[PDB]
Write a protein that binds this ligand. Sequence first.
Ligand SMILES: Nc1ncnc2c1ncn2[C@@H]1O[C@H](CSCC[C@H](N)C(=O)O)[C@@H](O)[C@H]1O
Ligand SMILES: CCCCCCCCCCCCCCCC[N+](C)(C)C
Length: 285
Amino acid sequence: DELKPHFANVQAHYDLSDDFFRLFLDPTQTYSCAYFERDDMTLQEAQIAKIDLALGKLGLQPGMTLLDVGCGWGATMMRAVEKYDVNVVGLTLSKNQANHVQQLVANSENLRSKRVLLAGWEQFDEPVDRIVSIGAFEHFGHERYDAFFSLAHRLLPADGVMLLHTITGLHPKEIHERGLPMSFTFARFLKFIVTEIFPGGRLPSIPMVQECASANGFTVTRVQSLQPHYAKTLDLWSAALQANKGQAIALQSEEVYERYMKYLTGCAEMFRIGYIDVNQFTCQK
Ligand SMILES: Nc1ncnc2c1ncn2[C@@H]1O[C@H](CSCC[C@H](N)C(=O)O)[C@@H](O)[C@H]1O
Ligand SMILES: CCCCCCCCCCCCCCCC[N+](C)(C)C
């Protein structure tokens, strides 16, 4: 109400078709950087490793209520429930993800409380014990960053903790100063992504996040980069989508197929050269 969630911008991507995303994401449908804890893990094992890495920093205890901001297709929520025995609330602006997670909730045999809402954090006003947000922060926009942290710090308990996992990047007009190549290919890359893949998307800077967090009552006790892991994650995603080209075009179109391949491979290369990063910020209240 005070802040209208950007449903259209987010749904433009995530509500394309579950069957389409199923063509390149691992079984859990985790759509974020995996963690190859061991160099020989499969994409699936690596995604669970990333979920445990994030959830393991929140000091979870049975009965707690965990808030997942930008729950995607629900893998993180359901593992928090099954593995850590905490109640959960997931927020998403995607209709298909909400509907999908609602089915996981309907068929769950676990006794804990699980809720999924087709709503943004902008509309969530319930006290929670801990918060986890992986890959959603990039959709908030520069004009919501402060509002987001203020809300998170408010809803959390006295000794609350939020694990914010988000992509971060260097400004093109800075990579050029240090004498690094392809500063133009990078700027052009970012434009393509924000206009054809993630409308309204914004690339956060580590200093930016650090600033908004501290300025809102949080103490970032740790920053962990998984940069190299994303290049790998993206290469596995593009490898899968390519072998599924036929199903991709059939379910969608050659236009969508070609566009997503450019997106996936392009991102992988930008992580490979290190112009974009991904970090988990442990935010202590
Ligand atoms: N303002 C907002 N409030 C709630 N969810 C939001 C949001 N802006 C973006 N999101 C959600 O953030 C997610 C980005 S995709 C990441 C999904 C999941 N966390 C995973 O790691 O697999 C989507 O589910 C999108 O709907
Ligand atoms: C894998 C995505 C890499 C994006 C690199 C930088 C380009 C644009 C700036 C970011 C804005 C949108 C980010 C959306 C991230 C979505 N996922 C969590 C689903 C990957």
